[model samples]
Each structure stands twice: as structure tokens, then as C-alpha cells.
Target: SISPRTPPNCARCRNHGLKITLKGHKRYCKFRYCTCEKCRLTADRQRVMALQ
Candidate 1:
């Protein structure tokens, strides 16, 4: 299932704390919005799963 808009941060990004930009769409996070491939893809998967 897709997570709600994050007040809780992404685990992967949190674990590897770097100011980075991903390659796809944007994802909302506490630090700022994450606009990278990994986060976008992760949120995409979750959203699709929720619909399914």
C-alpha cells in the first residue's frame, strides 16, 4: 500500500544521508522534496499497489 505523505522520512535515503537528486518524478519528504529515480519509483510502486 502507498504511504501517506511523509512526515516520516524514507528509510533508504535516511540511512544514506546525502543531498541528492533522483532521476524521475518528485516525492515529498521532510528535508525537502526528493526528485530522484529511487524515491519516485518507490512511491510509484506503493501508489500502484494501493490501487491494485
Candidate 2:
């Protein structure tokens, strides 16, 4: 029952108010081709944590 959530804003594409919708770890995993590197790191961390 995971819900889609918006990823945090980053310098890659700011001010455009771009909306990226993702579900669970997918949000952090760049499922929708998100170009934010910061989120990529966070996504890996979340993925590892989820397994624990």
C-alpha cells in the first residue's frame, strides 16, 4: 500500500516547479528519470534501509 510522493527540490531543475511523482523507494531510486544526483544518493540509502 505504498503511495506516490514528490521528490525534494534540487539545483538540477529548480524554479520550473517540475512535479515528479514516485512510489515508495522508487521516489528515491529515480524511477521517472529524475536528474537530481542528491536524490540518487538518498535513493540508495533508502533502498538499503528498506531491506533491513
Candidate 3:
């Protein structure tokens, strides 16, 4: 699930270097906790693969 609590550091953000739309959400809803806000954004919660 999306979270405000960061994970150690924004590694994904730094690595990716930008707010890349990794993928799109599913027809329904799914959530996944990310390492950071950037990760969360990248995760694109609401996708079937999201939400952990």
C-alpha cells in the first residue's frame, strides 16, 4: 500500500532519476508499500501487482 513512511532512502527515485510511470493501475484496485515516495509513485498502486 502507498505510504508516507520512507524506506531508508529514496533509492528507486535516485536510481530512476525521475518520476517515471513504470506502469498503469489495474481495472480494479491494488496497493503496495514502497521503499519511498518515489517507489510508491513508481509502484503505481491500484495495479493488480501493487499492495504488499
TM-score of each candidate?
0.35, 0.27, 0.23
- For model 2, how big is the CA root-mean-square deviation? 7.4
Tens-digit per-residue lDDT, 1-52, candidate 1: 5955544435335434733343231253342455566656655655654542
TM-score-superior candidate, 1 or 2: 1
Instruction: Give one digit per residue, the lDDT tens place, for model 3 in 1-52.
Output: 6886544433344344633332342221222333556556655543476456
Tell me the number of clashing residue pairs for each predicted model: 4, 0, 5
Residue pairs with colliding backbones in model 3 are: 1-32, 1-33, 31-50, 31-51, 32-51
User: In order, what lDDT does every prediction score?
Assistant: 0.47, 0.43, 0.41
User: TM-score of model 3 relative to the true fold?
Assistant: 0.23
Report the poorest 10 consecutive residues by lDDT, candidate 1: 22-31
Tens-digit lDDT string for candidate 2 (1-52): 4745545643222323433433243334333456456546644655665553
Against the true structure, candidate 1 has what lDDT? 0.47
